[PDB]
Amino acid sequence: DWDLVQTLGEGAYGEVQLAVNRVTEEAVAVKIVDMPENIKKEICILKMLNHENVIKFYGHRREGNIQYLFMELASGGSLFDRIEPDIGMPEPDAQRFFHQLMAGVVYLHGIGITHRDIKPHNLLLDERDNLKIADYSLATVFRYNNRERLLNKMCGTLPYVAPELLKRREFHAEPVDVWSCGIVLTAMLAGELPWDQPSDSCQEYSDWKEKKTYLNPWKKIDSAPLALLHKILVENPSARITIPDIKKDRWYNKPLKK
Numbered sequence: 440d441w442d443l444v445q446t447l448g449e450g451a452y453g454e455v456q457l458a459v460n461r462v463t464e465e466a467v468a469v470k471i472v473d474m475p476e477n478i479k480k481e482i483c484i485l486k487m488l489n490h491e492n493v494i495k496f497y498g499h500r501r502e503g504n505i506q507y508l509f510m511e512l513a514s515g516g517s518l519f520d521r522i523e524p525d526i527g528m529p530e531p532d533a534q535r536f537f538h539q540l541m542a543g544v545v546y547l548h549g550i551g552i553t554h555r556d557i558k559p560h561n562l563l564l565d566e567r568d569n570l571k572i573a574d575y576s577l578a579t580v581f582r583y584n585n586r587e588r589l590l591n592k593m594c595g596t597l598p599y600v601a602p603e604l605l606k607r608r609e610f611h612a613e614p615v616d617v618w619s620c621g622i623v624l625t626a627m628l629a630g631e632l633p634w635d636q637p638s639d640s641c642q643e644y645s646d647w648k649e650k651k652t653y654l655n656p657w658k659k660i661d662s663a664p665l666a667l668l669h670k671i672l673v674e675n676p677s678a679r680i681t682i683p684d685i686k687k688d689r690w691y692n693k694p695l696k697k
């Protein structure tokens with residue numbers, strides 16, 4: 440019924456392909472997984488999703504040991520491909536994408552789900568350039584029956600992970616996703632990642648902690664979004680800005696055009 444045309448992206452288990460229906464020509468995204476605990480959890484999370492800034496899940500089909508996960512194709516491609524290396528993108532476009540990213544993350548956190556791997560390759564765009572949070576292979580429950588569960592597993596992508604994930608045995612989920620959103624905002628406004636990892640052995644991270652904002656990528660960023668990044672990229676997660684307070688930030692609320 441479907442023909443595999445091109446690879447769309449990668450992940451820790453299986454692969455995501457562009458599939459074209461042999462009868463209707465309908466183009467969709469399909470995740471093909473070989474061989475059980477991890478896929479059952481992923482399917483469960485994908486079934487919970489219903490929001491404008493999260494990738495739409497059509498359903499799943501099992502054939503022997505092979506699992507197929509059907510998702511709405513993001514015709515605008517990835518946010519990664521909108522970032523010009525060493526430049527970024529126009530500040531109004533970055534602000535709009537950031538507003539949409541916050542909308543999707545508030546939605547996930549509201550249903551007690553943490554994404555755990557927010558980065559430009561996992562942020563896709565529809566026909567009208569609406570951002571959509573994709574890939575739930577690392578996603579997990581951090582709140583159930585109004586009771587929070589601490590995370591105790593290391594995962595994600597090193598330039599995007601919060602420092603507490605490397606240091607603490609257990610840590611709160613929401614500040615970790617807030618942090619990765621801050622690295623995404625830095626990438627959008629500067630076209631470069633600030634550090635390989637948020638550790639003391641990383642000079643670029645030490646330089647940020649020492650407020651050396653006269654260095655790249657910070658010197659490419661205007662004072663208003665930089666003031667927001669100073670509130671997000673806070674080492675101590677208990678002192679880090681929360682999403683309700685990000686929504687009150689001067690740059691977040693600044694009228695911008697084109």
Ligand SMILES: CC(C)(O)[C@]12CN(c3cc(-n4ncc5ccc(-c6ccn[nH]6)cc54)ncn3)[C@H](C1)C2
Nearest residue numbers: 447448449455468510511512513514516517573574
């Ligand atoms: C230019 C071109 C060749 O015509 C494009 C590029 N496009 C896309 C779409 C997607 N999609 N769409 C849905 C979807 C769900 C999950 C994932 C994913 C990424 C990582 N893990 N899961 C990726 C997904 N990814 C990348 N590029 C559309 C084809 C436009």
